[PDB]
Design a protein around this ligand. Sequence first.
Ligand SMILES: [Mg+2]
Ligand SMILES: [Mg+2]
Ligand SMILES: [Mg+2]
Ligand SMILES: [Mg+2]
Ligand SMILES: [Mg+2]
Ligand SMILES: [Mg+2]
Ligand SMILES: [Mg+2]
Ligand SMILES: [Mg+2]
Ligand SMILES: [Mg+2]
Ligand SMILES: [Mg+2]
Ligand SMILES: [Mg+2]
Ligand SMILES: [Mg+2]
Ligand SMILES: [Mg+2]
Ligand SMILES: [Mg+2]
Ligand SMILES: [Mg+2]
Ligand SMILES: [Mg+2]
Ligand SMILES: [Mg+2]
Ligand SMILES: [Mg+2]
Ligand SMILES: [Mg+2]
Ligand SMILES: [Mg+2]
Ligand SMILES: [Mg+2]
Ligand SMILES: [Mg+2]
Ligand SMILES: [Mg+2]
Ligand SMILES: [Mg+2]
Ligand SMILES: [Mg+2]
Ligand SMILES: [Mg+2]
Ligand SMILES: [Mg+2]
Ligand SMILES: [Mg+2]
Ligand SMILES: [Mg+2]
Ligand SMILES: [Mg+2]
Ligand SMILES: [Mg+2]
Ligand SMILES: [Mg+2]
Ligand SMILES: [Mg+2]
Ligand SMILES: [Mg+2]
Ligand SMILES: [Mg+2]
Lengths: 54, 116, 42, 113, 98
Amino acid sequence: AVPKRRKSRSNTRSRRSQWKAAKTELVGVTVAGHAHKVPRRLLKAARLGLIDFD
Amino acid sequence: PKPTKGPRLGGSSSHQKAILANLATSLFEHGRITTTEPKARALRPYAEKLITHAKKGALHNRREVLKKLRDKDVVHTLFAEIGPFFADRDGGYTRIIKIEARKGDNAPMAVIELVR
Amino acid sequence: GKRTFQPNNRRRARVHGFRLRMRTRAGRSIVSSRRRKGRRTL
Amino acid sequence: EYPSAVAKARFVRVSPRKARRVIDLVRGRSVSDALDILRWAPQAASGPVAKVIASAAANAQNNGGLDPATLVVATVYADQGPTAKRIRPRAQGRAFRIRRRTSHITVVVESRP
Amino acid sequence: TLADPRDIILAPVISEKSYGLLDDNVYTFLVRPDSNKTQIKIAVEKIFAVKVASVNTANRQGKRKRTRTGYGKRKSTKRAIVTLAPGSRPIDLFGAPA
RNA sequence: GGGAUGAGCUGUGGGUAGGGGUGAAAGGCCAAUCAAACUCCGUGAUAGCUGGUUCUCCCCGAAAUGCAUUUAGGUGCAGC
RNA sequence: GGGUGGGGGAGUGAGAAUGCAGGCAUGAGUAGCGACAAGGCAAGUGAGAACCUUGCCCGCCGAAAGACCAAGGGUUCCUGGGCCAGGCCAGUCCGCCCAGGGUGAGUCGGGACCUAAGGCGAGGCCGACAGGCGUAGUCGAUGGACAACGGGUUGAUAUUC
Ligand SMILES: [Mg+2]
Ligand SMILES: [Mg+2]
Ligand SMILES: [Mg+2]
Ligand SMILES: [Mg+2]
Ligand SMILES: [Mg+2]
Ligand SMILES: [Mg+2]
Ligand SMILES: [Mg+2]
Ligand SMILES: [Mg+2]
Ligand SMILES: [Mg+2]
Ligand SMILES: [Mg+2]
Ligand SMILES: [Mg+2]
Ligand SMILES: [Mg+2]
Ligand SMILES: [Mg+2]
Ligand SMILES: [Mg+2]
Ligand SMILES: [Mg+2]
Ligand SMILES: [Mg+2]
Ligand SMILES: [Mg+2]
Ligand SMILES: [Mg+2]
Ligand SMILES: [Mg+2]
Ligand SMILES: [Mg+2]
Ligand SMILES: [Mg+2]
Ligand SMILES: [Mg+2]
Ligand SMILES: [Mg+2]
Ligand SMILES: [Mg+2]
Ligand SMILES: [Mg+2]
Ligand SMILES: [Mg+2]
Ligand SMILES: [Mg+2]
Ligand SMILES: [Mg+2]
Ligand SMILES: [Mg+2]
Ligand SMILES: [Mg+2]
Ligand SMILES: [Mg+2]
Ligand SMILES: [Mg+2]
Ligand SMILES: [Mg+2]
Ligand SMILES: [Mg+2]
Ligand SMILES: [Mg+2]
């Protein structure tokens, strides 16, 4: 099966705009006084110092 | 414990068996291990059962542990420090902490450690 | 699964070399024609 | 309208579509929020984009002397750069082409209360 | 027209291996690629007024390098390794102490 | 799955060249192409056949019939 | 570098030839990422590590997936650097890039020794020309003859030092 004809700009764009990244929600944490923002699932690691904030 | 539902780690079930044994050995040797999150979740009950054998701490239990672990030094420390340390605690000997995923494949990672 | 080109330097020389070409007038004309065209190798 | 600073990253070796996927996450946000959104974004293109945004903020603070705490990512987009062509051999002697696309990433930050 | 032995010996080889051999009293030279062992032995004996035990030769092909679009080949060299007689006066390379 | 001490398998070197070779014979093979290889030249081969042939406006405006034809999807003369 | 006018000359006008060359879309962030031996942890290096280095486990080959040659390739070998191209991912690594270094024989494999099939071939015979064949001879190993073993050493050669 091969495409019968090339898609139109609108038809291509409607599908192409659905390929996007989901944004992760971030919470606030303070380590050694400095305050950072981390994803909530890493809150325990951030508190215990296993997170390298760079 | 409860068998894996779905495909076994590292390819086949024999490889999964080897993987669990090696991870348990490393965990008892170092007290703390960093690995992939599915592997840590699979390891937890497997390791706690061995710690229970060590808490019982008889010759029969030692043979049972040796049925799985091949590192005799790790077996010795498991029966001489780990079991006595956890004598007074009933279950829940380990702990899983989720950490940042690694590059290359974005695999979610975690650390698993003995409680103390 | 054997391909057509099996290299052999001595056979290549003895089948397509300078001394082979110079032996006949056809080969001499081939050499002269490549000289005329300006090829680096004859 | 607002005081602003510009930064550009030309010939970055990431496909423009892949760069757009992460740029759309931070367009319009403040610099501080955009930086950590890109920090925790798992996509690989989050690195170069974060570098450009940080460089633009640095330009504003150094050359323009603007307060970093009021900087907002106002404009950001990714154009196509030059494309290099390679060849991937396929079955039965066919040879297919491969494109190594690059991007030009432009960021404008402006300071506003 | 008149032949000089110094036309055969071109220059000494300077490298870690050559410096190692210098302690053993063995000298490495670059020679004209057409020469042979006996001619080299005669020439060294004449030049340095020394006694030569034996001569070892080796041909080395030149390296291929590419410059902008094509490959060019460096020149091929011949090295002669000369070991003096057991108790001969050393050859003073005049700057190669090892 | 067949042969596997034989009309065996195989390495190295050599020989047979295109209306020619070679063939325990299939028109098989002769450098991934063989009812006559490949390359260059004659050469811008030929094709009653297929396709294409690029700016504008004004005036007029058909034929698909007759005869002949190695002729019928071509063409000559007539007709328009 | 152009405009206008009187003349002169054209490679003078493209949308279609499954036309030619270059650039760029659609399919689409899709298929695929090349055998069914299998990887793990600790430590290190680093801006960056699933892939690099070290250690310890686990697994696979073992008439090979080990060790030597010949043919073929040609510096791919060693050391020190490198990391925008290449490696079907990343790479601090590399059979990739850069510079320098490295191959030592009276006895090993060949020539300087010998000939087979076959090649060339003084004269020669034959053939309008072109040329065909061939004697003397001379080449041509896959064969005949012919003298070395053990150990050590370099980052890289060794029956060669
Ligand atoms: Mg289907
Ligand atoms: Mg089941
Ligand atoms: Mg089994
Ligand atoms: Mg192929
Ligand atoms: Mg002269
Ligand atoms: Mg010697
Ligand atoms: Mg030699
Ligand atoms: Mg190079
Ligand atoms: Mg039978
Ligand atoms: Mg049989
Ligand atoms: Mg032959
Ligand atoms: Mg023919
Ligand atoms: Mg038939
Ligand atoms: Mg064929
Ligand atoms: Mg014919
Ligand atoms: Mg003609
Ligand atoms: Mg009318
Ligand atoms: Mg004009
Ligand atoms: Mg004029
Ligand atoms: Mg034209
Ligand atoms: Mg056009
Ligand atoms: Mg067209
Ligand atoms: Mg699809
Ligand atoms: Mg897939
Ligand atoms: Mg693979
Ligand atoms: Mg690590
Ligand atoms: Mg190497
Ligand atoms: Mg790289
Ligand atoms: Mg890569
Ligand atoms: Mg003859
Ligand atoms: Mg004659
Ligand atoms: Mg003969
Ligand atoms: Mg001979
Ligand atoms: Mg031989
Ligand atoms: Mg070696």
